Amino acid sequence: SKTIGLMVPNISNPFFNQMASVIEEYAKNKGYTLFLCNTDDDKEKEKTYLEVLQSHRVAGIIASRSQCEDEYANIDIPVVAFENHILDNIITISSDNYNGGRMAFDHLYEKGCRKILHIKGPEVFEATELRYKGFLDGARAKDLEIDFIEFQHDFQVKMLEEDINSMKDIVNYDGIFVFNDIAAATVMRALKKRGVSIPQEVQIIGFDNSFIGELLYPSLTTINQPIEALAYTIIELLIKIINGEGVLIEDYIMEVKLIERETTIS
Amino acid sequence: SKTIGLMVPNISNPFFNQMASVIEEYAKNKGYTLFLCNTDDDKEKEKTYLEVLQSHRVAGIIASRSQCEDEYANIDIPVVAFENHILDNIITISSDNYNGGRMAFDHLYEKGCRKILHIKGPEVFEATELRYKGFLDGARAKDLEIDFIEFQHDFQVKMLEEDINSMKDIVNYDGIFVFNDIAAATVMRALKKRGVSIPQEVQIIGFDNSFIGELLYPSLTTINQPIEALAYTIIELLIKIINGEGVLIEDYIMEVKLIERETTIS
Ligand SMILES: OC[C@@]1(O)OC[C@@H](O)[C@@H]1O
Ligand SMILES: OC[C@@]1(O)OC[C@@H](O)[C@@H]1O
Ligand code: NA
Ligand code: NA
């Protein structure tokens, strides 16, 4: 087989469809095509696709935001993981989510925010947990108390029909850090429906630098994940495993950077 | 195998991510999993994926906005097509794109628009050609001259860094019909960057009812494609072909409807 299976939480999140496009490019450079498999952050869908990919004898699997552990132990096909650690013998590639969360706090604080909310991601996403921890560590360094709201899912179309309890109070914050750009878009939509002015009344920073942050208005200040470097790295390492080349099985963490746009003041 | 290959022409476009999610649900109801294959509206990528899916002996293929023809002749795997016709012995499922184009014209005209632009899709998309023809036939019935601008691609992230020549003149139109909702979002972003008020200065209608129109602000008036009915139908018909059950090979066209939101005046 010259096909690699890429498991995607959902390509409805712009970040994952862009990642899938760029991984496909790097795979093509190495002579591979891709099958994309939608796992929807569901352990049983992931298990099913692992079985289906194995039965189809793909050359390798890229496992994004995995919720398994067990299931991977016997599979005899090369695997690399994006974000979530699976087993100690599978390489995990990620952005520097801890430091990105610190950068997000430092940016809001530098822009004068003192009443701060972090809309954090589901606990099962190692990446969002690290963003939360970096943000909180930043607040602790400034002796600032922060409020949290924890979403239980990444973006789903149903989110557009869901309310936040006490949405009327959100405008009272100086700044809000939202765990990713697509979730930030939903938060800004809710604020706009209530007539809230951004950034005049509240400042917003997201995470990813996915296309949704530039597509909408005002454009979203965010933390860049380096999709090209992530995709390059994932494919380079998977091909080493496929080829039986030596590589230390350890974390590969790519640098992030602040992208200042119109939802924070300057 | 119990796997169906779904060719996806634009994994960046909300409409196709939502279609893929719903097709997956209906396939699961019938006992099938899906592999998604990114064709990127490229004939060579489609040809490649067709070969890869055949080599993997999938149970059936859902072609989507296909640009091939003879490559499908005697591939001995069941195929159904979304939108673009492939061969006379392959069923094509689509929304009622001609009537949706007429509905879009009628709605702008009823809201008082007389200086009207249609940003039309690539000529290789049968669906957008029919939207253009329905819109134009509506204009001709009212003895109204319409202007056209023809995009050569569906949404790509690079569109966010591309300008329309004479963009500063677009505000002069009363109303704009854009060939789909994700393209409409890009047009609205350009207008907003220039300080144009929607719908006060220009009214906008898209096509699809994909989730981006409900993230847009103001929310986007559009023509609904019935994703649930499309997905149900694609899977029902593909399973008939797989099972060798009788079915007339003919067009299946699903009804569309206007969804009035905030980018046209109520
Ligand atoms: O949008 C993608 C993302 O930011 O969502 C949360 C995190 O898991 C991932 O990197
Ligand atoms: O967005 C999806 C879509 O509207 O794009 C153009 C048309 O091919 C298709 O139905
Ligand atoms: Na505030
Ligand atoms: Na106008």
XYZ file of C-alpha atoms and ligand atoms in Angstrom:
554
model
C 0.000 0.000 0.000
C 1.100 3.533 -0.693
C -1.756 4.949 1.362
C -1.662 6.488 4.843
C -4.779 6.799 7.008
C -5.243 10.184 8.653
C -7.676 10.272 11.538
C -9.314 13.649 11.863
C -11.559 14.709 14.841
C -13.689 16.671 12.436
C -12.787 18.474 9.240
C -15.630 20.842 10.141
C -13.007 22.576 12.285
C -11.033 24.721 9.826
C -7.779 23.878 11.555
C -8.190 20.172 10.830
C -9.183 20.625 7.231
C -6.146 22.815 6.635
C -3.937 20.331 8.433
C -5.362 17.516 6.283
C -4.685 19.508 3.099
C -1.056 20.157 4.026
C -0.388 16.638 5.334
C -1.685 15.393 1.970
C 0.905 17.566 0.182
C 3.783 16.290 2.265
C 2.561 12.690 1.921
C 2.421 13.117 -1.848
C 6.061 14.310 -1.864
C 6.974 10.950 -0.274
C 4.800 8.965 -2.699
C 1.690 8.342 -0.538
C -2.011 9.104 -0.868
C -4.275 9.673 2.178
C -7.620 8.290 3.377
C -9.257 10.703 5.843
C -11.272 9.193 8.686
C -13.604 11.224 10.741
C -13.364 10.159 14.457
C -15.471 12.966 15.965
C -13.557 12.792 19.218
C -15.259 9.472 19.881
C -13.329 6.522 21.227
C -15.548 3.977 19.502
C -15.311 5.656 16.085
C -11.550 5.755 16.509
C -11.506 2.055 17.379
C -13.628 1.240 14.341
C -11.393 3.199 11.968
C -8.266 1.636 13.443
C -9.753 -1.779 12.625
C -10.847 -0.707 9.147
C -7.462 0.881 8.321
C -5.663 -2.285 9.502
C -7.965 -4.511 7.443
C -7.166 -2.339 4.397
C -3.434 -2.686 5.032
C -2.550 1.001 4.889
C 1.146 1.761 5.167
C 0.784 3.920 8.260
C -1.712 5.790 10.438
C -1.710 9.351 11.813
C -3.827 9.418 14.994
C -5.143 12.870 15.945
C -6.372 13.755 19.410
C -6.614 10.041 20.201
C -8.706 8.684 23.083
C -7.378 5.131 22.871
C -4.367 3.450 24.356
C -5.111 -0.273 24.524
C -6.240 -0.662 20.946
C -2.887 0.424 19.562
C -0.751 -2.071 21.469
C -1.110 -4.978 19.067
C -1.765 -3.267 15.757
C 1.256 -3.987 13.595
C 1.160 -0.854 11.474
C 3.277 2.287 11.938
C 1.501 5.047 13.876
C 2.372 8.618 14.843
C 0.091 10.760 17.046
C -0.970 14.405 16.895
C -1.380 16.006 20.406
C -2.602 13.201 22.596
C -0.145 10.594 23.822
C -1.187 7.048 23.019
C 1.499 4.627 24.131
C 5.078 5.170 25.175
C 6.270 3.643 21.916
C 4.368 6.048 19.604
C 5.829 9.465 18.740
C 3.589 12.436 19.577
C 3.842 15.678 17.555
C 2.204 18.858 18.833
C 2.420 22.626 18.897
C 3.835 24.312 22.017
C 0.458 24.594 23.649
C 1.690 25.390 27.138
C 3.706 28.372 26.034
C 0.937 29.461 23.652
C -1.436 29.670 26.618
C 1.112 31.768 28.533
C 1.533 34.044 25.482
C -2.212 34.519 25.300
C -2.377 35.577 28.923
C 0.634 37.887 28.614
C -0.961 39.560 25.578
C -4.316 40.223 27.271
C -2.549 41.481 30.417
C -0.199 43.755 28.408
C -3.310 45.235 26.750
C -4.704 46.170 30.151
C -7.083 43.318 30.839
C -7.636 42.447 34.493
C -11.088 40.831 34.530
C -10.308 37.779 32.400
C -12.237 34.705 31.250
C -10.778 31.581 29.658
C -13.215 29.425 27.710
C -11.303 26.158 27.988
C -11.584 23.014 25.942
C -12.625 19.498 26.916
C -10.340 17.833 29.494
C -9.651 14.929 27.126
C -7.705 17.229 24.757
C -4.149 17.300 26.110
C -3.496 20.388 23.987
C -6.240 22.487 25.507
C -5.306 21.346 29.005
C -1.787 22.672 28.402
C -3.178 25.958 27.047
C -5.265 26.268 30.204
C -2.276 25.535 32.417
C -0.020 28.064 30.646
C -2.722 30.725 30.840
C -3.385 30.042 34.527
C 0.328 30.005 35.387
C 0.551 33.455 33.766
C -2.339 34.734 35.873
C -0.792 33.314 39.053
C 2.451 35.182 38.319
C 0.445 38.433 38.296
C -1.682 37.486 41.326
C -4.780 37.707 39.166
C -7.862 35.566 39.650
C -9.290 34.223 36.353
C -12.702 32.719 35.578
C -13.199 29.571 33.470
C -16.012 28.074 31.376
C -15.329 24.561 30.054
C -16.837 23.490 26.750
C -17.285 19.715 26.462
C -16.876 19.479 22.704
C -14.897 21.074 19.906
C -17.038 22.956 17.378
C -20.198 21.203 16.228
C -22.846 22.804 14.055
C -25.282 22.386 16.969
C -23.185 24.869 18.951
C -24.786 27.612 16.859
C -28.138 26.766 18.542
C -26.693 26.543 22.098
C -26.582 29.379 24.665
C -24.138 30.081 27.475
C -25.967 30.513 30.790
C -25.578 34.136 31.938
C -24.326 35.181 28.522
C -25.443 38.681 29.556
C -22.500 38.907 31.990
C -19.757 38.020 29.467
C -19.455 41.587 28.219
C -18.306 42.462 31.754
C -14.910 40.820 31.212
C -11.989 42.878 29.875
C -10.602 39.992 27.822
C -11.463 36.421 26.865
C -9.086 33.668 25.742
C -10.948 30.960 23.810
C -9.335 27.560 23.342
C -9.446 27.664 19.541
C -10.365 29.934 16.684
C -13.568 28.171 15.590
C -14.905 28.215 19.172
C -13.885 31.907 19.380
C -15.956 32.598 16.255
C -19.024 31.156 17.996
C -18.355 33.257 21.097
C -17.970 36.429 19.038
C -21.210 35.608 17.161
C -23.043 35.389 20.486
C -21.526 38.672 21.683
C -22.411 40.405 18.386
C -26.043 39.230 18.694
C -26.169 41.120 21.999
C -24.750 44.291 20.443
C -21.330 43.942 22.079
C -18.484 45.910 20.497
C -15.181 44.093 20.053
C -12.554 45.123 20.999
C -14.018 48.305 22.546
C -16.008 46.475 25.199
C -14.200 43.160 25.375
C -11.000 41.835 23.787
C -10.744 38.286 22.377
C -7.806 36.010 21.614
C -8.203 32.504 20.097
C -5.765 29.749 19.160
C -4.686 28.082 15.886
C -4.474 30.770 13.215
C -6.992 28.813 11.180
C -8.740 30.513 8.293
C -11.889 31.348 10.235
C -10.044 34.054 12.190
C -9.252 36.028 9.030
C -12.488 35.299 7.298
C -14.558 36.972 10.064
C -14.679 40.557 11.482
C -13.097 42.104 13.283
C -10.270 39.697 12.459
C -9.164 37.500 15.342
C -5.984 37.876 17.385
C -4.695 34.354 17.861
C -1.758 32.053 18.507
C -0.304 30.471 15.391
C 0.088 26.713 15.093
C 2.682 26.113 12.386
C 0.681 23.814 10.143
C 3.435 23.436 7.534
C 6.036 22.426 10.143
C 3.569 20.104 11.911
C 2.588 18.386 8.660
C 6.170 18.088 7.475
C 7.224 16.593 10.798
C 4.339 14.141 11.065
C 5.048 12.774 7.589
C 8.844 12.728 8.013
C 8.559 10.728 11.222
C 5.853 8.355 9.994
C 7.993 7.546 6.952
C 10.951 6.757 9.258
C 8.804 4.283 11.153
C 7.455 2.807 7.902
C 10.992 2.394 6.545
C 12.386 1.027 9.818
C 14.823 3.903 10.270
C 16.218 4.835 13.640
C 14.470 7.552 15.574
C 14.163 8.273 19.293
C 10.502 7.953 20.306
C 9.989 11.294 22.068
C 7.771 14.406 21.844
C 8.181 16.730 18.861
C 6.926 20.191 19.870
C 6.689 23.031 17.325
C 7.039 26.717 18.201
C 3.970 28.990 18.286
C 3.721 32.750 17.934
C 1.250 35.541 18.601
C -0.671 36.900 15.591
C -2.078 40.320 16.534
C -5.231 41.331 14.679
C -8.316 43.444 15.384
C -9.949 41.778 18.406
C -7.278 43.110 20.784
C -6.339 46.773 21.062
C -3.168 48.354 19.681
C -15.311 -4.832 2.604
C -17.940 -2.725 4.270
C -16.327 0.581 3.339
C -17.492 3.259 0.894
C -15.133 5.851 -0.591
C -16.521 9.366 -0.566
C -14.696 11.712 -2.891
C -14.802 15.220 -1.417
C -13.917 18.041 -3.798
C -13.248 20.769 -1.234
C -12.534 19.718 2.298
C -12.231 23.489 3.158
C -15.922 24.169 2.354
C -18.358 23.860 5.259
C -20.984 22.415 2.951
C -18.842 19.422 2.104
C -17.766 18.823 5.712
C -21.421 18.764 6.755
C -22.362 16.508 3.784
C -19.571 14.106 4.734
C -20.747 13.947 8.353
C -24.344 13.188 7.374
C -23.397 10.696 4.658
C -21.337 8.911 7.303
C -24.414 8.611 9.540
C -26.597 7.159 6.797
C -23.804 4.780 5.680
C -23.433 3.595 9.275
C -27.165 2.840 9.406
C -26.577 0.447 6.454
C -23.495 -1.165 7.981
C -20.734 0.811 6.161
C -17.785 2.990 7.164
C -16.437 5.779 4.902
C -13.014 6.800 3.665
C -12.930 10.459 2.639
C -10.755 11.321 -0.349
C -9.811 14.866 -1.059
C -10.029 15.551 -4.850
C -9.590 19.305 -4.680
C -11.613 19.791 -7.918
C -8.684 18.283 -9.781
C -9.121 15.648 -12.472
C -5.733 14.022 -11.747
C -6.412 13.728 -8.009
C -9.800 12.196 -8.769
C -8.195 9.722 -11.155
C -5.615 8.821 -8.525
C -8.237 8.254 -5.820
C -10.389 6.218 -8.156
C -7.418 3.892 -8.716
C -6.586 3.737 -5.031
C -10.191 2.985 -4.051
C -10.362 0.219 -6.684
C -7.092 -1.280 -5.464
C -8.554 -1.356 -1.955
C -11.720 -3.064 -3.192
C -14.148 -0.700 -1.501
C -17.797 -1.646 -1.758
C -18.811 1.518 -3.584
C -17.765 5.085 -4.440
C -19.587 8.408 -4.129
C -18.112 10.681 -6.740
C -18.661 14.342 -6.095
C -18.391 17.229 -8.568
C -16.554 14.807 -10.850
C -14.400 15.964 -13.759
C -13.897 12.497 -15.235
C -15.902 10.447 -17.663
C -14.260 7.465 -19.367
C -12.057 6.658 -16.359
C -15.250 5.360 -14.778
C -16.129 3.043 -17.682
C -16.087 -0.620 -16.547
C -14.377 -0.082 -13.156
C -16.710 -2.762 -11.735
C -17.357 -1.013 -8.449
C -20.713 0.660 -7.793
C -20.630 4.439 -8.191
C -23.172 7.217 -7.617
C -22.396 10.876 -8.420
C -23.182 14.137 -6.662
C -23.961 17.057 -9.066
C -21.795 16.409 -12.089
C -22.869 13.759 -14.565
C -20.242 11.122 -15.271
C -21.579 8.460 -17.594
C -25.077 7.615 -18.680
C -25.066 4.488 -16.502
C -24.267 6.289 -13.229
C -27.009 7.961 -11.158
C -26.538 11.666 -10.395
C -28.034 13.167 -7.221
C -28.231 16.935 -6.826
C -30.199 19.780 -5.325
C -32.587 21.754 -7.565
C -29.900 24.258 -8.516
C -31.749 25.785 -11.448
C -34.786 26.652 -9.398
C -32.616 27.817 -6.511
C -30.927 30.319 -8.871
C -34.375 31.581 -9.937
C -35.478 31.845 -6.281
C -32.405 33.919 -5.496
C -33.144 36.323 -8.290
C -36.814 36.586 -7.381
C -35.927 37.358 -3.757
C -33.504 40.163 -4.618
C -35.947 41.630 -7.129
C -38.828 41.494 -4.646
C -36.644 43.368 -2.131
C -36.247 46.185 -4.667
C -32.877 45.359 -6.175
C -32.377 46.512 -9.757
C -28.598 46.870 -10.052
C -27.595 43.230 -9.555
C -24.360 41.224 -9.638
C -24.012 37.446 -9.682
C -20.648 36.107 -8.601
C -20.804 32.802 -10.453
C -18.900 29.603 -9.869
C -16.421 27.763 -12.090
C -17.949 26.568 -15.404
C -16.889 22.978 -14.611
C -19.432 22.810 -11.756
C -22.754 21.795 -13.336
C -24.539 22.966 -10.216
C -23.280 26.522 -10.333
C -23.919 26.718 -14.093
C -27.557 25.849 -13.380
C -27.752 28.475 -10.593
C -26.412 31.050 -13.067
C -28.932 30.016 -15.716
C -31.898 30.142 -13.292
C -30.816 33.566 -12.018
C -30.295 34.901 -15.554
C -33.630 33.524 -16.781
C -35.267 35.385 -13.881
C -33.553 38.619 -14.889
C -34.619 38.178 -18.519
C -38.243 37.751 -17.418
C -38.002 41.176 -15.772
C -36.090 42.776 -18.669
C -33.192 43.458 -16.302
C -29.527 43.512 -17.300
C -27.322 41.665 -14.729
C -23.524 41.769 -14.314
C -21.383 38.659 -13.684
C -17.980 37.942 -12.155
C -16.764 34.360 -12.513
C -14.584 32.787 -9.827
C -12.384 29.965 -11.134
C -12.216 28.029 -7.875
C -14.395 27.128 -4.935
C -13.154 28.560 -1.624
C -9.424 28.226 -0.991
C -7.635 29.753 1.963
C -5.584 31.802 -0.478
C -8.778 33.660 -1.474
C -8.370 35.596 1.754
C -5.265 37.293 0.224
C -6.839 37.889 -3.231
C -8.632 41.089 -4.344
C -11.427 41.660 -6.854
C -10.390 44.289 -9.408
C -12.581 47.366 -8.927
C -13.729 46.084 -5.541
C -14.421 49.678 -4.527
C -17.306 49.658 -7.079
C -19.077 46.565 -5.709
C -20.921 48.592 -3.112
C -22.695 50.309 -6.013
C -24.836 47.203 -6.647
C -28.222 46.915 -4.901
C -27.882 43.142 -4.508
C -25.366 40.335 -5.061
C -26.039 36.611 -5.460
C -22.924 34.585 -4.695
C -22.681 30.984 -5.895
C -22.233 29.511 -2.419
C -22.168 30.479 1.224
C -18.408 30.127 1.811
C -17.678 32.338 -1.230
C -20.307 34.774 0.043
C -18.436 34.978 3.348
C -15.311 36.068 1.475
C -17.240 38.694 -0.462
C -18.808 40.037 2.739
C -15.371 40.206 4.393
C -14.098 42.312 1.490
C -17.089 44.615 1.707
C -16.693 44.948 5.479
C -12.984 45.820 5.131
C -14.176 48.781 3.062
C -16.794 49.903 5.581
C -19.823 48.776 3.574
C -23.015 48.234 5.577
C -25.023 45.109 4.811
C -27.913 45.047 4.057
C -28.329 48.812 4.189
C -26.052 49.497 1.217
C -25.986 46.126 -0.503
C -28.055 42.967 -0.035
C -26.418 39.522 -0.287
C -27.808 36.025 -0.888
C -25.649 32.886 -0.975
C -26.368 29.204 -1.598
C -26.194 25.982 0.494
C -27.329 26.850 4.000
C -23.983 25.655 5.321
C -22.908 26.591 8.822
C -20.795 29.563 7.785
C -23.929 31.599 7.012
C -25.044 31.387 10.625
C -21.499 32.425 11.820
C -21.537 35.368 9.434
C -22.822 38.649 10.864
C -25.195 39.701 9.743
C -26.354 36.116 9.170
C -26.599 35.155 5.529
C -29.793 34.846 3.492
C -29.344 31.713 1.404
C -30.869 28.847 -0.528
C -31.079 25.619 1.467
C -29.606 22.399 0.082
C -31.347 19.589 1.978
C -28.275 17.811 3.257
C -30.235 15.131 5.119
C -32.318 14.249 2.052
C -29.259 14.340 -0.232
C -27.240 12.076 2.027
C -30.108 9.652 2.613
C -30.689 9.417 -1.125
C -27.037 8.996 -2.106
C -26.654 6.121 0.353
C -30.011 4.469 -0.463
C -29.192 4.439 -4.172
C -25.579 3.326 -3.755
C -26.727 0.388 -1.613
C -29.195 -0.621 -4.360
C -26.403 -0.698 -6.897
C -24.175 -2.592 -4.451
C -26.955 -5.148 -3.788
C -27.905 -5.405 -7.473
C -31.441 -4.165 -6.855
C -33.534 -2.632 -9.609
C -33.436 1.106 -10.055
C -33.876 3.367 -13.073
C -30.640 5.241 -13.749
C -31.932 8.790 -13.820
C -31.397 12.156 -12.052
C -32.508 12.526 -8.428
C -33.096 16.254 -7.730
C -33.941 17.398 -4.214
C -36.074 20.470 -3.484
C -34.470 23.699 -2.260
C -35.948 26.581 -0.295
C -35.104 30.156 0.559
C -33.826 30.823 4.093
C -34.316 34.517 4.886
C -31.794 35.979 7.325
C -30.155 39.366 7.902
C -28.248 40.131 4.674
C -31.484 40.913 2.826
C -34.084 43.363 4.060
C -37.063 41.697 5.754
O -8.692 23.746 16.429
C -7.703 22.740 16.693
C -7.393 22.723 18.176
O -6.879 24.000 18.606
O -8.591 22.437 18.893
C -8.126 22.135 20.213
C -6.785 21.438 20.037
O -6.974 20.057 20.357
C -6.457 21.611 18.563
O -5.085 21.977 18.364
O -20.737 24.786 -1.366
C -21.160 23.658 -2.146
C -21.569 24.134 -3.519
O -22.648 25.086 -3.423
O -20.459 24.768 -4.124
C -20.851 24.933 -5.504
C -21.680 23.680 -5.814
O -20.911 22.792 -6.645
C -21.916 23.007 -4.461
O -23.271 22.556 -4.265
Na -15.933 44.481 29.095
Na -25.445 49.608 -3.091
